[PDB]
Subunit: 310 residues, 2 copies
């Protein structure tokens, strides 16, 4: 029977790109009856990627059991709360990911291929080369885009030396110029004007427990920090509501400039002294500039973590 292959809830480009590519690879090289599906519709950055290479969005599902599947393959995630609603009721045949492992468990052995690299799509690509399988131009496009999206065009410190090697091979296969296409697709996910502030602060947001404090950390990509900060009133009203509704001790929003690879940090809550101490900066009107920062998990969360435990 069919094995469904999917990325996380609130799919990003790497989630869609990795699962679409892996379902193809599995059919071609592993003898598997796989289908790529998605857990949500594409965001604007991914809608652009899909358009550019002329691939339809993988269909959305909400229950793996409803779709007839007894087995699934997860890509770009493993944590059960990031997965399909009924993940505990199906077998995990396999996982291809680049994140920490938590909230994840199986009854039986499985395939796992995890590497601490820039994207799941990087791993999937290298698996096409291992098995001598040709990469269709549109699948190369999708994988390249996964890698560019997760690392902001190889600028993030989550970029591994192997990523820097495969990026030009992927550009060639995809038929694009690396820097030009990369800039183009990243730009497509920076038009936030038509979204409400509530939506904005929940586009890419997670909660971290830091020495007993529930700290919410969101990120948005932009070509212009000032354009985001010019909506500051409604953003602060959304964040105060979020703090009120959810019991967050603190809310930190990363406003990430994709052109210059820096973030502005807009933060509100009980422990602002610890935010200032984490980054050696001074909040003015709830915000300060953080040079070089584009990775939540490498450049903001560990810094807060240390500071909150100090």
């Amino acid at each position: 029977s069919k094995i469904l292959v999917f990325g996380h809830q609130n799919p990003d480009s790497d989630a869609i790109g990795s699962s679409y590519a892996f379902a193809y690879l599995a059919r071609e090289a592993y003898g598997l009856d796989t289908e790529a599906v998605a857990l949500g519709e594409p965001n604007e950055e991914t809608a652009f990627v899909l358009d550019y290479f002329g691939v339809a969005a993988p269909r959305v599902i909400t229950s793996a059991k409803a779709e007839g599947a007894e087995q699934v393959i997860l890509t770009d995630h493993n944590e059960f709360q990031q997965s399909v609603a009924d993940i505990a009721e199906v077998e995990v045949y396999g996982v291809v990911d680049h994140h920490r492992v938590a909230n994840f468990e199986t009854a039986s052995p499985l395939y796992m291929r995890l590497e601490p690299v820039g994207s799941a799509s990087s791993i999937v690509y290298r698996m096409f080369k291992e098995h001598g399988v040709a990469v269709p131009k549109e699948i190369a496009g999708l994988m390249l885009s996964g890698l560019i999206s997760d690392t902001l065009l190889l600028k993030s410190p989550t970029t591994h030396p192997t990523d820097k090697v495969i990026a030009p091979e992927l550009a060639e296969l995809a038929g694009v110029n690396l820097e030009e296409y990369g800039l183009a697709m990243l730009k497509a996910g920076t038009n936030l004007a038509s979204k409400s502030a509530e939506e904005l602060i929940d586009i890419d947001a997670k909660t971290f427990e830091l020495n007993g404090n529930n700290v919410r950390v969101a990120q948005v990509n932009t070509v212009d920090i000032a354009e985001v900060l010019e909506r500051q009133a409604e953003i602060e009203a959304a964040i105060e509501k979020a703090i009120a509704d959810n019991g967050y001790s603190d809310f930190v929003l990363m406003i990430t400039d994709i052109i210059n690879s820096n973030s502005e940090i807009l933060a509100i809550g009980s422990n602002m002294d610890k935010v200032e101490a984490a980054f050696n900066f001074v909040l003015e009107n709830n915000h300060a500039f953080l040079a070089g920062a584009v990775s939540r998990k490498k450049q903001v969360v560990p810094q807060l973590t240390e500071s909150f435990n100090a």
Copy 2:
């Protein structure tokens, strides 16, 4: 800094073979400073393997922090309670394994290579091949012996079709005949007569919670079932004591004939009706014959699980 590579507590041949082999591969292919260590002394089967190929036992450690390690690599296990005592206090850099995932979590991304095949050694071998790293004769021997040990010379239902393809490749590299070396090494772990009955039932034993009931399932390998049962009285006595002292509802001993691939089941406790039902047999004198049974996790435990649940 030195990265420690090791298998699980109470190491079997696969644990030591896969950790020794991977520490070498990681130095040659990944530019890592790895050292293989063990969490216990070799059993009698593994000592035979190590003597055959001219390889010293990996030194035993008890604390990764005492050894000055900050990073470790786990082979043949991932469950924290099967690992080094201070596993929570160091970084898991990588895992290579063929078991289910449980009791396992990391703070950061990592390497994982998991496959539902017959041994971790099988996976390590494939990685040598994938990286173009020539396999030293003694390392092929350690890897082969891990596979043969975990699958009873490829007769276990845990054996994967890829195990059957690699075994002859590994035997040629190791310089041995598959069947004859495999039989010799398996016989080296059947020295039951010089163990007491208390030791015997605890050589390879695990507790499985089956619907509130704590069921102890032990296994021993022998060349002669009837010979093991010459000591039936002292085994039953050791068993009755273990049930009493540990509050097991039931105790199942598999006495596995390595020559013919069958087991005798000797069982004692509150739920024998469910044991008989699990296997379509009648227990006479607390035992019965179970044709084909060599794997506890595939041929004994699921059958008891389903039976213990109606």
